[PDB]
Design a protein around this nucleic acid. Structure first.
Lengths: 55, 117, 56, 151
RNA sequence: AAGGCGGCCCCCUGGACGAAGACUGACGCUCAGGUGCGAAAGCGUGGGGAGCAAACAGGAUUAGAUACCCUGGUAGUCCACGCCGUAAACGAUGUCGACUUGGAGGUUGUGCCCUUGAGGCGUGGCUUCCGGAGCUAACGCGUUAAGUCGACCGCCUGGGGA
């Protein structure tokens, strides 16, 4: 149920520089971590999330 | 030589040298100084002291511009990343922001081969 | 690793915060990792050795 | 001393003035265990270096030492396969020792007649901030300022 | 299946696994010769060529330095279509099936219970580490066996020459 349009939820799993946080830090399952990575990449494409802190 | 009061300190902290360039907000360079141009060659050039005196001499190359508040953009892994910032703050400068702008390729070009030293 | 020196903070604490942020971002480790080419077999062997020594 | 922490030996005060500085100066100037020969030299030099100025003796000797005392010196180091010279801060006891040793070697490298005269002239030069002892101190400070990057 | 496969999206497409059933009814295992796939390098034709970089040139180091180090740099690395058919192509461990104490994990289904909880208890598939009997020259393997067996295949017969 992870949606790339849920930026409020996706921002909890990215650092201050926009990088995805590892599953060891947030303690999320591997399956939902993969879903989160896919959703974050899609949201980066739609310019809803930044690729980096620069641009 | 007019008054800016708003600058950026571009620090290029390479492994072998340290280049400090003070520009305005737009990016036009006003003055610059390096570790190799401050009387350090070879082993002394890649030291935090050389970077410190380079940041001291670069801050003097912009005294005619009257800069009061300036930004810091650090780039590179070499020494003098924090030494230049300290030398800039000690030179009577209000450091407003510090930013790391080291270029990170998202797995782009192929780097050179390992040195078998 | 953007650090905005907020009001009522000295320069030294801002510099130490900048260093802490740049080390938690891992930019120096990455730029030291990317300066020479590491063969796929070399990086696989290194990852395997690190995963093995992470057992104590 | 790989493990040896060592104390300090008892140096006796000067018989004429009661100074440990002058006793160590006589010890440094002494050769072949001839302490009476060195004491006469030091006393003649201090007398001759007294009338010139006017601040008694001990004071003139300390004024001469103040100009030869090195604040920072370099220590050779072999780490990066080459001659590293790290400028280290000199301790006060080593400061006085270096100053006195430099003054003695500078006085012995002079063309005056007697060692008492050489000492008197070297101390007067040091008080005037010149000579070869002050030259060596400036050499050391120069070498330290050159390698300040290696602190 | 192996070689291998790493941004995101779409189109075509193979295999594996699980739940509860229905169906066919030995249709199975292995396989000389045969065929197919087969990293990298290399070859042919046509493109492309930023970075890296055999050959090559220069600067160093050295007794020498046809090397390590430095500055460049062609083929190549990239794409399409063919060829090559080799690797420490490794788990140095052929495939298929049955049986034999355990522990901690990972990953992926599924079932049960005021679901208390990101819960507990079962039940499959793949997978990592340790270890018992046993086996081994020892190292070690140890239910994913190098243990106990069965079927078939490939291979070995002192070191060089090779």
């Amino acid at each position: 149920e992870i949606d790339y349009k849920d930026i409020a939820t996706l921002k909890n799993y990215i650092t201050e520089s926009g990088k995805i946080v590892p599953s060891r830090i947030t303690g999320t399952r591997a399956k939902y971590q993969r879903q989160l990575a896919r959703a974050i990449k899609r949201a980066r494409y739609l310019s809803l999330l930044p690729y980096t802190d620069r641009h | 030589r007019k008054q800016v009061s708003d600058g950026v300190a571009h620090i290029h902290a390479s492994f072998n040298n340290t280049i400090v360039t003070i520009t305005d907000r737009q990016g036009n360079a006003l003055g610059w100084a390096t570790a190799g141009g401050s009387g350090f060659r070879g082993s002394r050039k890649s030291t935090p002291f050389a970077a410190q005196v380079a940041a001291e001499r670069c801050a003097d190359a912009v005294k005619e511009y009257g800069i009061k508040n300036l930004e810091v953009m650090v780039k590179g892994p070499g020494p003098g990343r924090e030494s230049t910032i300290r030398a800039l703050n000690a030179a009577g400068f209000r450091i407003t922001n510090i930013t790391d702008v080291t270029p990170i390729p998202h797995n782009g070009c192929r780097p050179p081969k390992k040195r078998r030293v | 690793p953007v650090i905005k020196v907020r009001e009522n903070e000295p320069f030294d604490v801002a510099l130490r915060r900048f260093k802490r942020s740049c080390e938690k971002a891992g930019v120096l480790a990455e730029v030291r990792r990317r300066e020479f080419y590491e063969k796929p077999t070399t990086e696989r062997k290194r990852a395997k050795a690190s995963a093995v020594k992470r057992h104590a | 001393p790989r493990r040896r922490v060592i104390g300090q030996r008892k140096i006796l005060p000067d018989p004429k003035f009661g100074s440990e500085l002058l006793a160590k100066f006589v010890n440094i100037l002494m050769v072949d265990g001839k302490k009476s020969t060195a004491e006469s030299i030091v006393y003649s030099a201090l007398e001759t270096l007294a009338q010139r100025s006017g601040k008694s003796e001990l004071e003139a000797f300390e004024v001469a030492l103040e100009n030869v005392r090195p604040t920072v010196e370099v220590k050779s180091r072999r780490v990066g396969g080459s001659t590293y010279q790290v400028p280290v801060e000199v301790r006060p006891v080593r400061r006085n020792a270096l100053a006195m040793r430099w003054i003695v070697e500078a006085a012995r490298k002079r063309g005056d007649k007697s060692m008492a005269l050489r000492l008197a002239n070297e101390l007067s030069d040091a008080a005037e901030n010149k000579g070869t002892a002050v030259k060596k101190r400036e050499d050391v400070h120069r070498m330290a300022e050159a390698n300040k990057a290696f602190a």
